[PDB]
Each structure stands twice: as C-alpha cells, then as structure tokens.
Amino acid sequence: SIDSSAIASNIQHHADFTPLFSPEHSSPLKAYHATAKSVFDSLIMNWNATYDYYNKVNAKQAYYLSMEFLQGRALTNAIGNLELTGQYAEALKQLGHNLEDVASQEPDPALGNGGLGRLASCFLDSLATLNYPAWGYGLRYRYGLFKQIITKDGQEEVAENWLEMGNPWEIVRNDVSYPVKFYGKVVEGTDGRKHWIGGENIKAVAHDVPIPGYKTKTTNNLRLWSTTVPSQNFDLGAFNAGDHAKANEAHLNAEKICHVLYPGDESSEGKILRLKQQYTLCSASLQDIISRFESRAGDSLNWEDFPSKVAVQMNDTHPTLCIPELMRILMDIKGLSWNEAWSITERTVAYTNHTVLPEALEKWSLDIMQKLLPRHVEIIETIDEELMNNIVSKYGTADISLLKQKLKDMRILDNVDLPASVAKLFIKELDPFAKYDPQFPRVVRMANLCVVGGHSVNGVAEIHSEIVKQDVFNSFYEMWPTKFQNKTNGVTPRRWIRFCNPELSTIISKWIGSDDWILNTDKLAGLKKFADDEDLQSEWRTAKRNNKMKVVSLIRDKTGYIVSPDAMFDVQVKRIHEYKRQLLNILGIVYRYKKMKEMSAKDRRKSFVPRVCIFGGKAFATYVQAKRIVKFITDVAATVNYDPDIGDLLKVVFVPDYNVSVAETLIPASELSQHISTAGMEASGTSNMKFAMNGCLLIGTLDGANVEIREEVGEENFFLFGAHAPEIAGLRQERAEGKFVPDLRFEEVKEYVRSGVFGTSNYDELMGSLEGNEGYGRADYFLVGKDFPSYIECQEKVDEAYRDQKLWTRMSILNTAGSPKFSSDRTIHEYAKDIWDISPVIMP
Amino acid sequence: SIDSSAIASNIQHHADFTPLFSPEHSSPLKAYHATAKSVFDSLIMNWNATYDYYNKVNAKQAYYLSMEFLQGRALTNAIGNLELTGQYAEALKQLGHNLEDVASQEPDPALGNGGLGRLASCFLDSLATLNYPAWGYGLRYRYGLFKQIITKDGQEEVAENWLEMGNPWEIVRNDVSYPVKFYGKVVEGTDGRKHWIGGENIKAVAHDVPIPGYKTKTTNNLRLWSTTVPSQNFDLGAFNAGDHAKANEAHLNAEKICHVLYPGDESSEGKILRLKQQYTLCSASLQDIISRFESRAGDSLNWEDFPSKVAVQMNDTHPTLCIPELMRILMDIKGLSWNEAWSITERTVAYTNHTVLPEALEKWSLDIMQKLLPRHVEIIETIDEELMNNIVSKYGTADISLLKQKLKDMRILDNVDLPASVAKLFIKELDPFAKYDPQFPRVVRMANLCVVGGHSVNGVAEIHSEIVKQDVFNSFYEMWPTKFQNKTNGVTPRRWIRFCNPELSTIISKWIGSDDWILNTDKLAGLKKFADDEDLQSEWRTAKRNNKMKVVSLIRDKTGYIVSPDAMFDVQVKRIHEYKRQLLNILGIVYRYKKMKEMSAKDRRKSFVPRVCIFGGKAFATYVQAKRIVKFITDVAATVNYDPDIGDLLKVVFVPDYNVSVAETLIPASELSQHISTAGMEASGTSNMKFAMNGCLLIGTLDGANVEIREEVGEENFFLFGAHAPEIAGLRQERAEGKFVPDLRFEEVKEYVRSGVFGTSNYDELMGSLEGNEGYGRADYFLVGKDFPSYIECQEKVDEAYRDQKLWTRMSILNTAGSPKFSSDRTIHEYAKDIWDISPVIMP
Ligand SMILES: *Cc1c(COP(=O)(O)O)cnc(C)c1O
Ligand SMILES: *Cc1c(COP(=O)(O)O)cnc(C)c1O
C-alpha cells in the first residue's frame, strides 16, 4: 500500500506546491529538490513520532557535540534506510528521470572536513539504526572549509555554495532560539550570586537535520546552530549616512561564526572567532539540553537526576567549554552549590581524544579567554585550584620536586601565579616555578580541563588508547585510572557497503544467504569458507571491475584524463600533509616510471603490472609545502599520462575536491589503498576500514587502524612495510648526528626529479625538504627516505600478487570477511554501555 | 465540495509538513504561517494557470515598475478574493484559533512607504480583478524604510523584521537569474558593435508574489528582485587572515541594494547606491521582459512587434533608466539600428508623473552616472543630440534667444558642451551658454529624459495634469501635445471597504440589493436616495461606532492612552512634513484646548463637541523640524489627555508606526479626516479617497484629490477652507515685503506654546519657524498663520454639524455614494485603453 505511483505524485506535488523554480522549467536539479522533499515527508512523520515518544519515556539521552559533521548526500541513504529504493527508482522513470542522475545533483553539505566529522556522522547512523536516544549538536556552516579546484598552479580554494538554494534536509525551528554572550564582566549581586552582564549578545537558532535509522522508524536528530542578531541591530543611521558596512557590522559579527569551518587563527581576530564558535556550540547546546530536562521533569524536578538523564560527549577538545559552561548555568542560573554542580558536571561530561602527540592539544591564551569569557575563567580558576589540592593530598609536600612535576603535567592554567594554598609549599621567597613568568605566555590547556571535567576519557584504537595512558595523560591515569578507556572507531556498513556498493552487496547476500548482514555485520565472517570458490571469485572480480568504470567517468569528467579500467586501481585518499606522506607514494611512482623508461617495451610489461594511481584530498591553504606536493603530483600526471612509451601501463591522477560523494564512487572501485603515515603518527583512520569492507587491499605502516585491521583480516592479506613506532625517535636522532645514509635508489629519484623531466618547475625546494640533518621543514623528519627501500620493495610484492588474480581475489574476499569489527554499530554499543549508560528505546 | 473541514486539514498539513517550529509549539504565529500556506496553495494553482494561458495567447502584457509596493498584509484579502472567508473562519475555530487574531500576527511587508507604492499595489489588485495581463516589477527590500517607535524623545527609527522567518507569500525562482553590471567601460569591437566590459557584476534573482483577483481565477504577479553574488565571490584568503569584513565585501555590495528603501543620499556612497538600485530594477526587469517576448515568439520573431506585445510603465522618474537600457540591449545585444531601436523604445515606454513642483524632479550628477553606467551616458548623449536637432527644426536659428530658452527647458544634460551641430548656431567665439561652466554641476535631468523617451506622459489628477502641461513640461507640451494625458488616481474597494470594513459592507449590500458593488462600484450611487432614511442612518452610525471600538484597542495597546468611542474621531494620517501641515492641525487643537481652559465647565460642553484627535505617519529621519513636530504632538497628548478639567472632551493621540495595517483599522472608524496641505502642493492623495468611501467627512484645502472628491460628493458634504493655489506666490511675496499681519488668535497660540505648559521643552525653535519675513526654514513659507483663522473657523462649522447627527450621517452616506469615481478599477480601464492599449484575457 506504499507504491511507486503514489510517490511519483508526491514528487510532482512538491515540484509544484513547494516550488523553487518556474513551473515550465525542467531540470535534474528541480527533480532533486522535489524528490528530496518527497522523501523528507517520511522523515518528518518518523522524526515527530520519535521526538514525542522520547518525551513520554524520559530515558537517558546521549548528546554528541562535534565541530564537524561530514553528513554527505542524504538522498540515496534516506531512501535506502526507508527501503523505498526500488519504488523511488520507478517513480522517477514515470517522470522522465533517473535516480542516480538525480542523486548526483545533490551538493555535499559543507558541514565537516575529515575523519573527526565523518566519524560523528557514522555514529549518528548507528545510533538511529540501533534505536538509541541520541542527538548530534553542531554549527550550520555556510561556506564550509573550502571547495578544492585544481589548476595548472596546484590547488586553489573556493567557498562552498551548498546553501545557495536552501537545504531540503533541514527544518528551521523559530521557537528554539538561545542567547549567547561575549565579553562583558562579572559582578556579585544582591543575593551573593554571580551575574554575567553587558558585553555582546547574539542568538543561536536551531536547524534540525533528521537522521533516519535503517529498517526502523527511529529517526534521531542533528541540531545545528545558525547565528544571527535581530533586525533591530541594523544601524539605519550608519546606513543612510553612507557607511553601509558599519550599518551591517553587528550582523556580520553574529553571522561570521557560522561562515567558515576552522577559520585561520594566525591573527587575534581568527582566535577570537574560533573561540566564539566553540562557546556558541557549547552554550546553545547545553541551554537546549537543560531546557528539555526541565520540560520533561515537570513538577518532580531534581537536579541530582541530571547525569542519570543526560550524557554529553565532547568530540575532541573543541567542545571543552561545556565543562565550565555547565558549572556556570547550574550555579548562576539554577542556584546549585559548587560541589553539587561539580558532581553533576563530572558525571554528565565525557571526553574522546583523537590526538597521539602531546604537543597537538588545544591551547588558548588566558588573556584572550579572560576578555571574552571572564566568568568561565573564574570557574576554570576554581577547578584548577581544586585539582591542585587533590594532587597535594594524593602525593606530597614531603617530596616537592616530585610535586613540582605532577603539578606541571596536570595544571589547567600554565604559567600562572599559584593559588595561595598551593604556593605556600614552595616558600624559601616563592620559587620561580610558583609565579607568572612574562617571558612566556599564560596558557589554558584544554585537554587537561577535559580530563578533570569528564568521568571517562577514551582513545579511538587499542594502540592509541595505550599511548593516551602512557605518554599523553600519564599522571592523570595514575590518579584516576578508571577514567581511561578505549573505543575503537568504526564506519556504517549501510553508507559504506550497501548503498555505495550495491553490486558487491548483492553478491554478499547471495552467498551468506540473506541481507541481514547489513544490520548484523558479524555474519560477513561466513565468507571465509567461500574465499577459494571459483564462482564467487568470478562475480567478485566482475563487480570490482564494474565499480571501476564509474571512476573512469569521474576521472575523465573532473580531470580530462582517459584511463583504462583493466589496470590496478591504486588509491591514496586523505588530507595533504607531510606526515601522511603522499610524497612517499608519488616518489615511489616516480621510481617505477624511471625504471620503465630505462627498459625495453617487452620488459616493461614483464616487470610491472598496469596501474591507475589515484590521489585525492585537501591541503591546508596556508601550508606551503603541502600545496607544492599537490602541484608536484599534477605535474607528474601531465608528464606520465601523455607518454607514448608508457600508454596504459601507468596513469597518475589527482581527483579534485575529495569529499563523501567522491569517496562513495572511488572506494568501491579500489583494489589497493595506501595508509602510509610515519609509524606512530596516526590514532586510527576510518577510510582504512571502508576500503577493507569493499574488498580493497591495504598497503600501510604498522600505525593506527592498520594494526587492528591486520589482526582481523590476517597478516597474509595485508601489505606491511616500514619502521615501527618504537624505532622512530631513534632514527631521527640518528639523522641529527649524521649517521643516516640513504639508499642509492632514493638519491636516484631525487636527482631524477631535480632533472626537470616534470616541466618548468625543478622542485629543488621540495627535494630539499628531504635533505640536511636538522632544521624546521628539512631533514626528512617523517622518514620518507628511510622507509623508501622497504616501501618500493613492498610494492613489488603487490605486483606479484596482482599477477595471480586468484590469490588477489582470495585476499579481497578475506578483507570483507574480516571487517565486521569495524562496524560503527559495535562501536556505539560500547559507548552506550561503558560510558553513556543508555539503553535503546523502541517504539511499538 | 470545497468545505471548511478540508481547509482545516490543509492548515494542519502545512503546520506539520512545511514546518517552521517545533511540533509541540503552539502559537497564533505558527497558525498564521500554516494558514498563509494553505491559502497559498490556491494562489499557486491559479498563478500557474494564468501564467500558462498568457503564454498560449501571447496578448500584449503591461509591466508596472515602481520602487515601492505597499502590499500590506495578504491573508485577509487573498481569502476574500478567493471567497473562502466564511470557511477559513470556521476551519480556524476547529483548530482552536480565531481568524482575526491569526491575521494580526502577519507582519506588514516593508516593500513600500507612501502613496506612490500603495497606488501601485491597488493597481495590481484592479489589474487582476479585471483580467488584464500585467505584472508589477520591484525590489525585495529586507529592512524597508524603517519601523517607527515613539519614545519620550519623539520618533526613533528601527530596521524592519518582516523577513526574519521568511515570507510565505512568495516563491523563489532559481532558474530566473539575470546579470547586472556596474562601472566598467565601453569598447568598439571587431564588428563595429559596442561592447560594455569589465566593472562589477551581480545577479538579480526573481521572487514572485502572486496577486489574486476578486471573484476570478486570474492571478497576476509581482516579480521582486533580490540581489546577491555567487558563493565563490567570498574571499577565503581574507577570511582566514582575520579580515572577515573584507571576505564579505562583495556580498555586502550586492546585498545592500535590497537592504533599505530610499537610502540616504547626502553622500557620494548613498547616491551611487540609490542609482544601483534603480538600474538593477530596470535592467533585471527589462532582461526578463525581453526573454519572455523571445520565448513566446519562437521562430516567428520580429522586433517591430515588440511594442505591440509589451508596455512598460515608469512610476515616477525612479525607473527612467529603462529608456537607455532598452536602447542598450536592442542595439548592443540584438543588433538593431538606432532608429529601429528608438522607435520600439518610444512606443514601449510611458511615464507617470506625481510631482507638482518643477524643482522636485530627479537630477543626477553626470560624473557619477558616467562612472557607473558609461554606456548609458553615451546613449543619453545621442538622445539629447537628437532632441536638440528636433528643437532646431521645429523653431529657430532665426530667433536664437527664443531657441536658447527652448533648449534650456528641454535639455536632458544641463551645463554640458553642446554637440557640434547645435553649438554652431551660437558662434560670435562660442556663447558662454553653449559651454560647460565649472561654476555649476553637470546634471542629468531624468524627467525630461522620461518625456522624450515615452509615448505618453500623465498626471494623477485633473488639476495636476494641467499643471504638468502648463508649468512643468510646457515646451514639451507645445512640441508633442498628444503625449500628455490625465489618469486620476483611485483605490481598490475590496481592501478599502469590503475587507477593512465588513460591518459597513453588509449595510451597503442590503440597501443597494446586492454585493455586486464590490466589483461594479458605480452601483454605490443608489445610496443617494436613502441618505435621509432614518433606519439606514441608525445602522450606519452603529457601524461607525463599532469600527471605532477597534481603534480604542489600538490606542490603548500602542500608546497606553484610554479614550472614549463616543467622541468625534478626527484623524490626520500622512507623512510628517511642514508642507502637509500637521503643525496647522495641532496648533488648532492647541487653540481649542486654550479656549476650554479659559471657560466654565458648563460652557466647555456648550462650545465644543468631544473629540479624539489622531495623528499618524513617519518623519524623514534627517528632517530635524519634522521630528520636532511629532515630539511636539506627543507632548500635547501627555498634557491634554491627563488634564482633569478636560476629561473625555478632548484627547490627542499619536499612533506609532503608521502602515497599511494601521490604516485598515483607523480609516473605517474615522468621522473626520484632514487633508490640509498648502494649496497647490499636493498632486492627488489616495487616503482621501479611502476615507470618503468609509463615510468619513473631509476637512481640507482646494488641493489635489480634494478638488475632484468635492465635485463628486458635493460641496455641501465637504469642509473647505484656506487660500487657493493661485493666491499662494502672492501671499509669500506679500510676507517677504513686510505686509502680512497675523491674526491675534494666532499670536495667542504661539505665545501659549512658548509658555511651557506642554512640559520642559519650550519650542521657541518650532514657533520661530513661523516668524520673520525671509530665510530658509523660517517665515512661515507654508502659510500656517495665514490659513489659521479660516481653518479654526471651518472647524467650528464641523462641530455645529456633528451636533446634528442627522445631518452628519446624511453627509457620511453621501460621501460613500459619491466615491465610485475613485475606484482604481476605472483608473486601470483608462490606463489599459488610452496608454497600454491592452485587453483583458479571460480563461475559460
Ligand atoms: C572516511 C572519510 C575520511 C576519513 O579518512 P581518514 O583516512 O580516516 O582520515 C575523510 N573524508 C571523507 C570524505 C571520508 O569519507
Ligand atoms: C493610502 C495610504 C497612503 C497614501 O496616503 P496619502 O494621504 O494619499 O499620501 C500612505 N500610507 C498608507 C499605509 C496607506 O494605506
């Protein structure tokens, strides 16, 4: 009773009765907005039912705050989760359209950037699919980070246009507006209570993005804050006098908070904005959560129940301000005591860490924060004093040098005059250590504040979670060992197998017996025994090849290069950074090119398997060397791809504007993917898990997610190379004292690049970053030269394996069979049970 | 088969499936947006049918361009014209709401200001109602002119908020975008043809506001341009470097065009913007009109047919640039010759003039225009050369001093070097007259360009249209007498009787026999014979009184003052200006107050009829004296309203933020309205006509619309006072040479105001503007003192008439009976036949 012909009518209805175009206009885009709105009707029904039932039950609700959400296109996945994928397809034929064609008109929401945000997004899919009561909270970015375009100069950055016609996947909630305050000062009022007055005032308005679960009515929510000020803040006097910018100054201030993701902060103005961004996310979100708690509790309202009804999860340090903000409201607005409020805060908040380096943890100038959020600094000050008295107790006086060290490590406010209580212990008068030294900045360490303020701290992979306990927060682990956990990352198998790779999905559900694996992904393990079946292997290679043909279109379309699908599709797809070592990959390609060119055309075929080597991802605009690296790759592509001696034996391609949509086409087509960061530098990595699910083989270092992926799929089905994490610091110091001697094959490439064969750029600057023994930006800090021989050898093993397409496809199948551990579903279960302490809420 | 219960469902549907609020939220406002969207579904159906049928028929289409459209609230009138007024009322009861209550939640669109715009709006109602194919073109103003608030300092100006939640009465047309260019320069290309290159580029996007006719499916359109630039014009480099305003500079430039109506132009930046505004309206609109002509013509496309398919009407001089812009496109883009293009332009364009003073006609600096629109100045230059050669022919050489005068009067470009052809005739070398004199600015006279460029020029009232021929454009009238016309203004009887005054409307349709008068307003004349019937008079006075009670609410609500409905409701409602003479009214009130206070409480009742004297309207922010006048009135209100000796004998009230919605409540309640501008200063006036329709009696000067209103309703049913137009200049010169001696009663008031009785302001400054014999801002230029005795006497006749509520109500009824001439319907018929040459297009 829910058929294709009624859907076609509702699509038509939306084109005409919620129109964005002239009636006689006929576009795939017009069809998209109509089809999006037809699907949306289902999400609204289900959203309202889910919203209402949660209020009735009043179960504990989890809240995931992130500065990023890589939502990607919604259409294909909403239709998928509703299981109207077959009927929407036909409905669109009736109207003279094609689903796939219409779906490719959807713009990627510019609401995230990399893994941090995509994880959050996968987490929202799993939460809904498994019927957990949970929302995401975030900011509604207009222009995103940037849309990447590739010219003959390298990468250029253009602002995103995804909101130009409005977002059909959201609902504005005009009754949901919260005030957020900047600057001002604090005064103690009549009733001993603190009051934060004056300053600047903006309002955050709610923009809801429903999150439909798979094979369930449960539709959770992503609440997005958009900043503005009321029309009356427009200065007409300024406007009429001619000063049109002044007239618009107040609106610009509010609105710019939601303009760009991670705005550049090499300026006091960029730092203030980045800080306004975070407080707005924290303040608006917490005010809303508090509001919902109150409305549900009704007359029987008790704040001790707050952490048994509310869980707040801080994705990275960006939402750290939740801690003091919660303390702010509980005391200043609700009237709770410090200890009463602190206990509620500590039990409500938890922190997830994605960093492996202790000098990559968010720091802020106290002076800047003190000016913008004076009441929060007061609160932080009190928190840091408590923390220090607890260290005093749990340790010393007796042994002071020890205590000195414990206080450095754990302090929230670094380089500040100690509170009078602690300062005592260092009289002799006071030790230089217990005083502000103007030679250095006064700094607020957000990571330490997150640890102190949350009941749980977790890493994102087994090895990393240990690094977190041993290197990063050691003295904290000593103090509160029970805080520290691990929650290995995962990705949703619905977006990243079922819907991005339908051809593989059919093969999977045939041989396993059902399509239940989409939900109960453990059942993929039943593929192990069929790994050597010849027929499975036939279908499995055909799918891979069919998925590769959609990439041929993408490459032709986006770059102009013509490539053959009968080569090996070798992909490296991640953010452009020296530590990720795209440079190691391209230089390995350069070596093989060189070998080919010093070889007979008979031997070229005998020695190397044909490849299409694909690069993708964004460089931080200001990062000069990263931009030179994408430039370098493009130039190699130009030289290699148009070389008669090579032909289809090797192609190199840089796919521009890598995003969720690109990944969705690229990943299912991939046979080899590269995860080759300097060992010890990666915490996890989620693209790794996506590739393996799609039967792509991994070449990588013993680093981040690769380690656990290798366990699950088997070491025989993974190409491992390079120095391990423990060996690094030693190899660097070895370099510093002149003892490192690079392979002859590595000097060959460097010289061959300095040769000019890749155009009118020489690159002596880039190659120069792999030379010397010391210096910032030089001295091959990320061990490209060191790992080179091991790496180019490992790629010879890949070639030899690809020669036996029996072995290759066997390993491909074993990767999909070993992926179950990396479903975000079991990641969420672990979070739900061991941190948030929430249960599923199933509607009847 | 279109019943109240289905409508209630559709209202509900829109609340839930085109939502702007949380689902559990319950507001009159929420009900409004839902009810608006339910009505809108009907407008869409009818809009699309009307749009499609016009394309089929390809009849000549009229296009009304204005910088203003005072649309007012749409809800009550759309529901009215659809005749679902009874069923929407019940549908809203079912949902626990009240139509009137819901309607009062609609914000007034800030798309206009005064009469200019309201006329345009009435014109759109009449065009639809009478089935004429016609659109309005305008700009989509965000903040409007300003929302007026009254404090203890006078008026203050706040930006309007009408778009904060979006406009339910519009449809964005994303496929309708047109490029508009600013600055740049001209170059003659390969093919002798001119090309306008470089400069700045913005895009105007179409926002359609359907205009439903009354008792007809015909739903015409108001196309509104909103300016923007594509996201990519956002400078990320600037944003990340910290310079967030610079990053937003390009967007601000585009968007500010649509920010404020009539932005202040005492700055080169305000003048450039005002000029960008007008060109954008002209360019975008003409590009669209041209596009529609082409798509309809198909293969059989002939540009000679353009003026037989297209009429462009310029409301005032603001759209003057249509003339050269049309010439631009026809030659530069379509390839027509000058004469071929000129003939098409002259036959397509027509001009309506609303000005009575020849020094109130829009002038622009040539230098500013030459910089912004260089190609348009070239075209204007050529037009002005033609014009001058035609004057040469039609006159002189022989008589040069004569020719000198004819060229001054008619020139488009004033104070410019004459073209070589004309310059000859003044050799002796060249006369100073035929040269640019840097002592004065170089000026472009837009009015003269409108006259030259249009086939018809019309005034807006019989007397004014004559002034236009005799004083304003005399030498043009001599040259082309057939151009000059009259089209007396009118107002729609649907918004301004039927829907604003339902209680009167019932009485009208009873005694006339039907409600057909709403359409065929001529049938109101049948009320003359019932003027003296006692029963009609009973119902008629009851309605007036019932309508007055809604004003009591408005006054209480907006000012706090408590007033009795059993007094005379005496209203002056128009823009605050010295020439309109609110000051004359208030000073007359001040005189009566003074008399009351020097009188016994028995006599106070014997001498004066109780009144509620209501003022309303906006002062130009920068106009110091106008603002002091509203301040002065408020202070009188404060003193008078709280005086025990007075009580309900006299109240004075300044209703803040006068707009369409205020008028709709105020007008039907009004018994006396004032139209007292210095004689000869007003061209027409439409509020005058509204009042008379609602049975309000007029006190006014022999000026503008009053003259014709007095003819139609009868001199016995109109309170005339003051000096007539011909006597003015003489009375002013009389003042200049010391010969004017004011009434003793006028010095009494002035002194009594200088007395301080009205608070801690003395007003010696304001009273000082009525004193002296010469000087800007002084010397009683608008004859307040002169007309005073005549005026306060005329008000004594009003009192004596109001005493006999038989006579008063007789005259009231005769005003409604005499109003038929002032229906915008017959105004439109005249425009349709004698200018646009269009016919109605009725769908089957
Ligand atoms: C999965 C995914 C990522 C994360 O990639 P890592 O290699 O884990 O950093 C980034 N971007 C997009 C578009 C993705 O789909
Ligand atoms: C009718 C009307 C006007 C025009 O009034 P005039 O006295 O003709 O200038 C102005 N404003 C509003 C809101 C109106 O309804």
Numbering used by the authors:
A (entry chain A), B (entry chain A): 68 to 495, 553 to 968
Manuscript excerpt for this entry:
Quantitative data about starch phosphorylase protein abundance and enzyme activity are lacking and no crystal structure of a plastidic plant starch phosphorylase has been reported so far. It is known that starch phosphorylases are members of the CAZy GT35 family of glycosyltransferases and catalyze the reversible transfer of glucosyl residues from a glucose donor onto the non-reducing end of an α-glucan chain. While Pho2 is localized in the cytosolic compartment, Pho1 is a true starch phosphorylase that acts on starch in the plastids of the plant cell. We determined the crystal structures of HvPho1, the first crystal structure of a plastidic plant starch phosphorylase. A native structure of HvPho1 and two complexes with acarbose and maltotetraose were solved and refined to resolutions of 2.7 Å, 2.9 Å and 3.0 Å respectively.
The native structure was obtained from a crystal formed from a drop in the absence of substrates, which was then mixed with another drop, to which 10 mM maltoheptaose had been added. The intention had been to obtain a crystal of the complex, but no maltooligosaccharide ligands were observed in the electron density. TLC analysis of a similar crystal-drop, where HvPho1 was co-crystallized with maltoheptaose, revealed that the maltoheptaose was hydrolyzed, mostly to maltose and maltotriose. Accordingly no maltooligosaccharides were observed in the electron density of this HvPho1 crystal and we refer to it simply as the “native” crystal. Two almost identical HvPho1 monomers (R.M.S.D. = 0.19 Å), related by a quasi-crystallographic translation, are present in the asymmetric unit of the crystal. One of them had weak electron density for a citrate anion in the active site, likely a crystallization artifact as citrate was part of the mother liquor. Consequently, one citrate molecule was included in the final model. The structure is similar to those of the cytosolic phosphorylase of A. thaliana (AtPHS2), rabbit muscle phosphorylase B and E. coli MalP, including the presence of a pyridoxal-5’-phosphate prosthetic group covalently bound to Lys814 and similar dimerization interfaces. An overlay on rabbit muscle glycogen phosphorylase b suggests that HvPho1 does not contain a functional polysaccharide storage site. The ordered part of the L78 insertion overlaps with the location where glycogen (or starch) binds to phosphorylase, in a position incompatible with maltooligosaccharide binding.
